[PDB]
Design an enzyme around this catalytic site. Structure first.
Site, PDB file in Angstrom:
ATOM      1  N   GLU A 169       0.812  -1.243   0.000  1.00 20.24           N
ATOM      2  CA  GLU A 169       0.000   0.000   0.000  1.00 20.24           C
ATOM      3  C   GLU A 169       0.821   1.257   0.000  1.00 20.24           C
ATOM      4  O   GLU A 169       0.485   2.203   0.743  1.00 20.24           O
ATOM      5  CB  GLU A 169      -0.956   0.017   1.233  1.00 20.24           C
ATOM      6  CG  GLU A 169      -1.860  -1.220   1.145  1.00 20.24           C
ATOM      7  CD  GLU A 169      -2.907  -1.305   2.228  1.00 20.24           C
ATOM      8  OE1 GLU A 169      -2.893  -0.654   3.285  1.00 20.24           O
ATOM      9  OE2 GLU A 169      -3.761  -2.180   1.952  1.00 20.24           O
ATOM     10  N   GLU A 276      -6.394  -7.319  -2.243  1.00 22.34           N
ATOM     11  CA  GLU A 276      -6.897  -7.415  -0.865  1.00 22.34           C
ATOM     12  C   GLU A 276      -8.346  -6.912  -0.837  1.00 22.34           C
ATOM     13  O   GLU A 276      -8.649  -5.956  -1.574  1.00 22.34           O
ATOM     14  CB  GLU A 276      -6.213  -6.437   0.123  1.00 22.34           C
ATOM     15  CG  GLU A 276      -4.720  -6.720   0.427  1.00 22.34           C
ATOM     16  CD  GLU A 276      -4.179  -5.766   1.472  1.00 22.34           C
ATOM     17  OE1 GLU A 276      -4.945  -5.070   2.188  1.00 22.34           O
ATOM     18  OE2 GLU A 276      -2.927  -5.683   1.571  1.00 22.34           O
TER      19      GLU A 276
END
Ligand SMILES: *[C@@H]1O[C@H](CO)[C@@H](O)[C@H](O)[C@H]1NC(C)=O
Ligand SMILES: *[C@@H]1O[C@H](CO)[C@@H](O)[C@H](O)[C@H]1NC(C)=O
Ligand SMILES: *[C@@H]1O[C@H](CO)[C@@H](O)[C@H](O)[C@H]1NC(C)=O
Ligand SMILES: *[C@H]1O[C@H](CO)[C@@H](O)[C@H](O)[C@H]1NC(C)=O
Length: 344
Positions: A169, A276
């Protein structure tokens, strides 16, 4: 068979089979110290029909932990240390050994955006600056690339690596989106220079895409531009993540988030991985539609829910959070066995 994972069309070719895949996140698999617990967890993921597991490739500290505790790198202003001992990268070596034995493939990111297991903040503690200047902090980037070499050189000729991933991320809050474009370009060229057998990706959440509905995740406040990033030649596929509870959106907004990302990957001629996702409330009801959208949208190559949960021979449970889908539970039947059965 066992071969390197490649791309054919806008799909993945895994052990000679070209087609959509389902996988799962198991960040914590990398830090298990008992080999039997990696073996039982990977047996369950493989027997469930999943083909790819995402595990952390980092565990960064600034002080050495209590004796016996796992750590992969100690970051310090006066000389950093990469741990290749039994309480270090040998735990990740066994995860790769077990992936090879179970015919599983792994996605492995090299640093966390967030402070869990150190992250960019452990580099800022050692090398100064802050979380947005990290990308061009020469001392921090020099150590990061040393750690990337130390991980990639262990497994560069293993057929169990699905892809190297620049980070979990990565964001640059309030930055120009060019800061991550130029960092991602340079660092993926470096990873390709160490290993020509494996795919490379960014590991971003997919923020910043103008074909959406103007909600915050489609705007450009977090330093990423999805369409600019997926066009980078040395990134082989795009990644995106999805958490409506954290992002202030409703669950059904997730379908358009998948569709817009898939179309941006296909416009760039590459696959996307829906890497995810989770819903805190009623995950069987709220996440099963997302899995069907991903499976049925051109441009998608596979999806991986956040996250696997499991339990060990001594009665201990794995690390977990409100998004864990426990093996063998009713949510496993709904979001794992039913989904693998729909794929094939
Ligand atoms: C981070 O450092 C840069 C350079 O000094 C500065 O421009 C930016 O405002 C800083 N971030 C915060 C949140 O202070
Ligand atoms: C390992 O992979 C590299 C490409 O990344 C290749 O050049 C080298 O020949 C391979 N090693 C062996 C021993 O085959
Ligand atoms: C999983 O569930 C099956 C029953 O469906 C059971 O036979 C098996 O022992 C269970 N596995 C674990 C690890 O508990
Ligand atoms: C919320 O999502 C969209 C707005 O993005 C709205 O039109 C839709 O009706 C809402 N759906 C639910 C089920 O809340």
């Amino acid at each position: 068979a066992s071969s390197f994972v490649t791309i054919s069309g806008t799909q993945f070719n895994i052990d000679g089979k070209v087609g959509y895949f389902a996988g799962t996140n198991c960040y914590w698999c990398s830090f298990l110290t008992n080999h039997a617990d990696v073996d039982s967890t990977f047996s369950h993921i493989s027997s469930s029909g999943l083909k790819v597991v995402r595990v952390w490739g980092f565990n960064d500290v600034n002080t050495q932990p209590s004796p016996g505790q796992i750590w992969f790198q100690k970051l310090s202003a006066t000389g950093s240390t990469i741990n290749t001992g039994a309480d270090g990268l040998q735990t990740l070596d066994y995860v790769v050994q077990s992936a090879e034995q179970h015919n599983l493939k792994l996605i492995i990111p090299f640093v966390n955006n967030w402070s869990d297991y150190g992250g960019i903040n452990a580099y800022v503690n050692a090398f100064g600056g802050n979380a947005t200047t990290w990308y061009t902090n020469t001392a921090a980037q020099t150590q990061y690339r040393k750690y990337v070499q130390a991980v990639v050189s262990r497994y560069a000729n293993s057929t169990a690596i699905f892809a190297w991933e620049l980070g979990n991320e990565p964001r640059c809050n309030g930055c120009s989106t060019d800061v991550i474009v130029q960092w991602a370009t340079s660092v993926s060229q470096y990873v390709k220079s160490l290993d020509s057998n494996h795919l490379v990706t960014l590991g971003d959440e997919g923020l910043g895409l103008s074909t959406g509905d103007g909600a915050y995740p489609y705007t450009y406040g977090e330093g990423t531009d999805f369409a600019k990033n997926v066009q980078i030649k040395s990134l082989d596929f795009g990644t995106f993540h999805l958490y409506p509870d954290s992002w202030g959106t409703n669950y059904t907004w997730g379908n358009g988030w998948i569709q817009t990302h898939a179309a941006a990957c296909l416009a760039a001629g590459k696959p996307c991985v829906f890497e995810e996702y989770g819903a805190q409330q009623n995950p069987c009801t709220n996440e099963a539609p997302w899995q069907t959208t991903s499976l049925t949208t051109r441009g998608m190559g596979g999806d991986m829910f956040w996250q696997w949960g499991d339990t060990f021979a001594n009665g201990a449970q794995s690390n977990s959070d409100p998004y864990t889908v426990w093996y063998n539970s009713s949510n496993w039947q709904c979001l794992v066995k039913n989904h693998v059965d729909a794929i094939n």
